């Protein structure tokens, strides 16, 4: 099992995108997904002010600049991987479809309809 | 005890003592519309069930004993298994295909009873 | 006579003869939503009261005599004062803190009665 960095695609997919401190970061994760099987690691990041949200074309927004210095601390809680592939398999970061970021939290929930009427035999007569 | 649907895995005769627990749980313009549709629907669904109980002569009751005989072809089981072994979910699946037949028969026996009671007055 | 709430200052036993008077009075997109919310609410409030009367076995009645004993701890008064001296507003304040207890007891006596009536059939 080998890890590799992302495959070609646009910036919004090939990098780790997130919004923090009010600004949109595009970080290069190749330093995290470069290994066979299994200080600190520094990932360089790019910043954009013009943002095309989700996968839409036609609605762009301008992120106002944020005054001062931005520092964010967060918890990585999971990964979205895609398998590149019978003797070896390579996993790469993937995603870009935001539904998979919610699918990961809503997996425990199901919605059901209550149907309160029912009939059953009993030994009685009106 | 347990609240809403806490009896779901209990047997049919252990359950059906909690009928009031479930009965009471049936009760920017775009968000306003979605919320209203959810609320109107809850009301219409509630009223369809109440109308149907009214048609069958079971208005105002949670347990209604009728005069329709049970067909062994709907479920050939003895009361001991249905009420002491099975859960309501299992039962609902077992007789799903006969529900419309049963409902039709309940409507009909009520129409006859209701007319007979008029003739007696 | 007087219409809606005209009996509000009358004594409890002078009032309660006008129950149908009050019962019948319970029944640009933004304005449309506000009006609908007011109307949906009126319906939901109405139905919650009707559901509750149904649970207590009082469906279809304005005056419903039940089988729950009165606790002297809820209000230690004789019928003569409650019905001939007090108004309904005063009474509601007097026993406000026992309302939920009373409602719980009414629900329970109905569940028992309803089951006993099934066993008798």
């Amino acid at each position: 099992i080998r890890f590799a960095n992302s495959s070609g695609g646009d910036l919004e997919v090939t990098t780790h995108s997130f919004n923090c401190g009010g600004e949109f970061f595009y970080c290069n994760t190749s330093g995290l997904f470069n290994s066979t099987w299994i200080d600190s690691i520094t990932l360089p990041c790019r910043i954009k002010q013009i943002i095309n949200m989700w996968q839409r074309i036609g609605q762009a927004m301008y992120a106002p600049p944020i005054q001062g210095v931005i520092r964010c601390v967060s918890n990585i809680t999971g990964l979205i991987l895609t398998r590149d592939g019978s003797t070896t398999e390579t996993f790469r970061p993937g995603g870009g479809d935001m539904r998979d970021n919610w699918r990961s939290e809503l997996y425990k929930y199901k919605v059901v309809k209550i149907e309160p009427l029912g009939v059953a035999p009993t030994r009685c007569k009106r | 005890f347990l609240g809403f649907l806490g009896a779901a895995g209990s047997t049919m005769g252990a359950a059906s003592m909690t009928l009031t627990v479930q009965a009471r749980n049936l009760l920017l313009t775009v968000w306003g519309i979605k919320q209203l549709q959810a609320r109107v629907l809850a009301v219409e669904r509630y009223l369809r069930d109440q109308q149907l109980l009214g048609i069958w002569g079971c208005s105002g009751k949670l347990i209604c004993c009728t005069n329709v005989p049970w067909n062994s072809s709907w479920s050939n089981r003895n009361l001991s298994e249905i009420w002491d072994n099975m859960t309501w979910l299992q039962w609902d699946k077992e007789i799903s295909n006969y529900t419309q037949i049963i409902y039709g028969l309940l409507e009909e026996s009520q129409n006859q009873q209701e007319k007979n009671e008029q003739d007696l007055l | 006579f007087l219409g809606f709430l005209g009996a509000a200052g009358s004594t409890m036993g002078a009032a309660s003869m006008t129950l149908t008077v009050q019962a019948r009075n319970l029944l640009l997109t933004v304005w449309g939503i506000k009006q609908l919310q007011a109307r949906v609410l009126a319906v939901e409030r109405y139905l919650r009261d009707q559901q509750l009367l149904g649970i207590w076995g009082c469906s279809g009645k304005l005056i419903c005599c039940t089988n729950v004993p009165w606790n002297s701890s809820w209000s230690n008064r004789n019928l003569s004062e409650i019905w001939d001296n007090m108004t309904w507003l005063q009474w509601d304040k007097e026993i406000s803190n026992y309302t939920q207890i009373i409602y719980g007891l009414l629900e329970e006596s109905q569940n028992q009665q309803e089951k006993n009536e099934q066993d008798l059939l």
């Epitope: 009993t122 030994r123 009685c124 | 049919m12 005769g13 003895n78 009361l79 001991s80 009420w83 002491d84 | 028992q112 089951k115 006993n116 099934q118 066993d119 008798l120 059939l121």
Partner: antibody, heavy 124, light 109 residues
Framework: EVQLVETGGGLVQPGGSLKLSCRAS????????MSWVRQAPGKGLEWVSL????????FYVDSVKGRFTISRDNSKNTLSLQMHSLRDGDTAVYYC??????????????????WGQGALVTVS | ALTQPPSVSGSPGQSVTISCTGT?????????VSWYQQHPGKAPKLMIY???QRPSGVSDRFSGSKSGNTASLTISGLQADDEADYYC???????????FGGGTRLTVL
């Protein structure tokens, strides 16, 4: 194996009262309806009273209807029968018996499955 | 109530029949006619219930049936251990729940 054990006094004067009881074991008490049956010293059996499994419904033979009370307590596994007024004609062995009715959601019985040995009650 | 006061008898190995006569709005219309066996000094035991059924623990020497307004209990391979009083009873509807007949003494010869 189940047991029904009748207890209670066996001697009263007419015009008085007497409480009998029946302790049950070996089965779920609360699942069965129960009755009392009299055996007159020189005759046969007579049904006197029946109580529902939950204690909600009670039935009596007309001859004791205004005098006897049948009660049940499912937490102690016991029945009780409270006799009042009492006549010489009420002398009998009073048997505790399991059965008599049904619970609606279960097959009916309408017969008596288990019997105790009986308390002897004499009205002098 | 129900009736059958005389004794019934036969020798070991002979069958005997015990009748129980009631009325239409009683034993005739309700198929709930149990039979009980009472050895003197003991509480009665259930032998037959409903009409033909027996409790587990009851031998097949005991069986029965009904017709019209009369029920009966049949004992086949009569034993000395069958010397007991037998009673029939029946569900007699609501209000009058149960009635019993007098018992019959079964004598083994």
């Amino acid at each position: 194996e189940v047991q029904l054990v009748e207890t209670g006094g066996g001697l009263v004067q007419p015009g008085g009262s007497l409480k009998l009881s029946c302790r049950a074991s070996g089965y779920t008490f609360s699942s069965f309806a129960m009755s009392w049956v009299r055996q007159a010293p020189g005759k046969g059996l007579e049904w006197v009273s029946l109580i529902n499994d939950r204690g909600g419904l009670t039935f009596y033979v007309d001859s004791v209807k205004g005098r006897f009370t049948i009660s049940r307590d499912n937490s102690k596994n016991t029945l009780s029968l409270q006799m009042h007024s009492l006549r010489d004609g009420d002398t009998a062995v009073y048997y505790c018996a399991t059965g008599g009715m049904s619970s609606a959601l279960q097959s009916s019985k309408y017969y008596f499955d288990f019997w105790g040995q009986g308390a002897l009650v004499t009205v002098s | 109530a129900l009736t059958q006061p005389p004794s019934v008898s036969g020798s070991p190995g002979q069958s005997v029949t015990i009748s129980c006569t009631g009325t239409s709005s009683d034993i005739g219309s309700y198929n709930y006619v149990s039979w009980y066996q009472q050895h003197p000094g003991k509480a009665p035991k259930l032998m037959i219930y409903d009409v033909t059924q027996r409790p587990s623990g009851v031998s097949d020497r005991f069986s029965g049936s009904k017709s019209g307004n009369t029920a009966s209990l049949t004992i086949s391979g009569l034993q000395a251990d069958d010397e007991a009083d037998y009673y029939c009873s029946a569900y007699a509807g609501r209000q009058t729940f149960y009635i019993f007949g007098g018992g019959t003494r079964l004598t083994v010869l």
